[PDB]
Amino acid sequence: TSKLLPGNIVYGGPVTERQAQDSRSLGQYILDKYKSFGDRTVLVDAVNGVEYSASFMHKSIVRLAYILQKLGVKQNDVVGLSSENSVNFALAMFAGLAVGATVAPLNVTYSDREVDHAINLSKPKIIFASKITIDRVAKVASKNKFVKGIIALSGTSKKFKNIYDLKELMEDEKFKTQPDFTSPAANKDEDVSLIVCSSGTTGLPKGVQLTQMNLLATLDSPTVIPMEEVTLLTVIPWFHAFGCLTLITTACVGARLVYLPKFEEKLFLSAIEKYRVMMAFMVPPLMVFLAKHPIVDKYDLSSLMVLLCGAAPLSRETEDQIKERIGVPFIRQGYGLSESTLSVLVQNDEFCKPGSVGVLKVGIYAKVIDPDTGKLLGANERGELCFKGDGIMKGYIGDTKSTQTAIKDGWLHTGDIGYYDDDFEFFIVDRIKELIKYKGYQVPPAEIEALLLTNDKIKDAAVIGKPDEEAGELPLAFVVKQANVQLTENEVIQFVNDNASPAKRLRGGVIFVDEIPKNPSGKILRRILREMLK
Ligand SMILES: CCCCCCCC(=O)OP(=O)(O)OC[C@H]1O[C@@H](n2cnc3c(N)ncnc32)[C@H](O)[C@@H]1O
């Protein structure tokens, strides 16, 4: 029930439920939820086929929570998490939240300098790490005195002084703990539950701080199905806000959360078939895969009911394609930023126009402002989207300048161009910083990208501005064709020439490639793309 308030501000409605917010801390709300689920399955390791009960989660969170306190972790301390999706990941995060510590997950594919830059943003006192990243993490922690200890969820290393094996700690008979642990009370308004590293044009990430309030208010907020009885698959990485908050919310609703370490084409399809996955979180890259890759037909996907996509531009042409190929009833697209905790806009049964991002979630205000002025725009006027509500981040840790630039008067200036129609359904056009500056025009690469993805001969597409002396930027398309097909640069140029405005002309040419660089969250790594121009 969105409302158009005076002044051209859109409102998603008042937040009715207050269960999570009433809690004394996110750690206590998670523990009680898990305990209240009894012995039901809540986590399924798809690769190894191991079901995990709610009581197993509760017991392990209690044990690990005590161990953290013994190791010196105190309320509002920071603990790092560098690991693929796994039960130990969830156990590590929940335990850290149980003791009232900030959890700072770290991208698993990070490099020495990115890892070093991340842990220098949040300054974790203890860091969890699996075998895939322990060597890099231990090596980096050596050059940072604030890191007092590393816990290895798997594997080992000698490049750091104080390393603990999680298995030995959990099982230490000499360390006696009670069957139940209770989380301390949090200043929900200021205590930081999560520090999520966001990608930016800087090349190095910023640390967005999400308070307990941000998370509890989000918890208190797509289809008519009760999520509790849902078998849910999440391939988005859990160190990203989308996958991270999706793991928490799904956990609090008692759903059956199936997971893979990362994403893999065959493992993804295989998981949906074996475990009868009914709903899955996706990023556009996976949606395009479902829509294009021929391997998709080699699997039984009948159990799939809902596809929840977000994090990057997704066109209706791709949505329709997927629905017409595999026959999934519900495809819902959502929009949000790391700075907005989770989504601020989601499609539903009533507001699910093709290619839209839905309507505001309760408690969130939205406004479309014209850049180069604060002019608040009306319906159907494109402008920079700004959001206000209980989901807005507290700010970039240690970077008050970047925070003032982003949050004005409680409004998050997302930096994206969008608009809302007369039903207050929102549409995301593109990111201002990624608009191709060609002869004063601000061409949205996402528009051309959607057009190129309608061509059955194109498997993936990414458009970038090519540096030019007179024009400044010329649209250039990185194209990934399908296997058994013939495609030429001229044919691609002709395609957009006959279906797009003269400004979208691929004057920069075509550059066929077998794979487009994407980040673990499905965002086109434009930075890398501009480097390949050779
Ligand atoms: C249920 C939905 C859960 C979504 C959570 C993901 C949060 C996240 O993505 O955090 P990030 O900070 O990494 O991304 C922030 C930036 O990503 C771009 N963006 C994000 N969503 C869309 C979209 N639906 N359509 C077009 N663009 C999108 C945009 O430009 C934005 O400013």
Numbering used by the authors: 2 to 222, 226 to 538
Sentences copied from the publication:
The fruit fly Drosophila melanogaster expresses a long-chain fatty acyl-CoA synthetase (ACSL), CG6178, which is 41% identical to Photinus pyralis firefly luciferase (Fluc). Insect ACSLs are promiscuous enzymes, recognizing a variety of fatty acid substrates. However, unlike fireflies and other bioluminescent beetles, nonluminescent insects such as fruit flies do not biosynthesize D-luciferin, which is required for light emission in beetles.6 Moreover, despite its homology to Fluc, CG6178 has been shown to be incapable of adenylating D-luciferin, and does not emit light when treated with d-luciferin and ATP.
The crystal structure of CG6178 was refined to 2.5 Å resolution with a crystallographic R-value of 0.19 and an R-free value of 0.25. The first methionine residue, last six residues, and a section from 223–225 were not resolved. The addition of ATP dramatically improved crystallization, but surprisingly, density for ATP is not observed within this structure. Rather, the electron density maps are consistent with an adenylated fatty acid. No fatty acids were explicitly added, but CG6178 is known to accept fatty acid substrates ranging in chain length from C8 to C20.2 The presence of octanoyl-AMP (C8) and an ethylene glycol in the active site is most consistent with the data. Comparing the active sites of CG6178 and Fluc, residues 342–347 of CG6178 create a protrusion that occludes the binding pocket relative to the corresponding sequence in Fluc, especially due to the Leu346 sidechain. We hypothesized that fatty acid substrates can readily traverse this narrow constriction, whereas the relatively bulky d-luciferin cannot, or at least not in a conformation suitable for attack of its carboxylate on ATP during the adenylation step. We mutated the leucine and surrounding residues that comprise this bump and found that mutation of just two residues was sufficient to improve light emission by 20-fold, while also lowering the Km for CycLuc2 by ~7-fold.
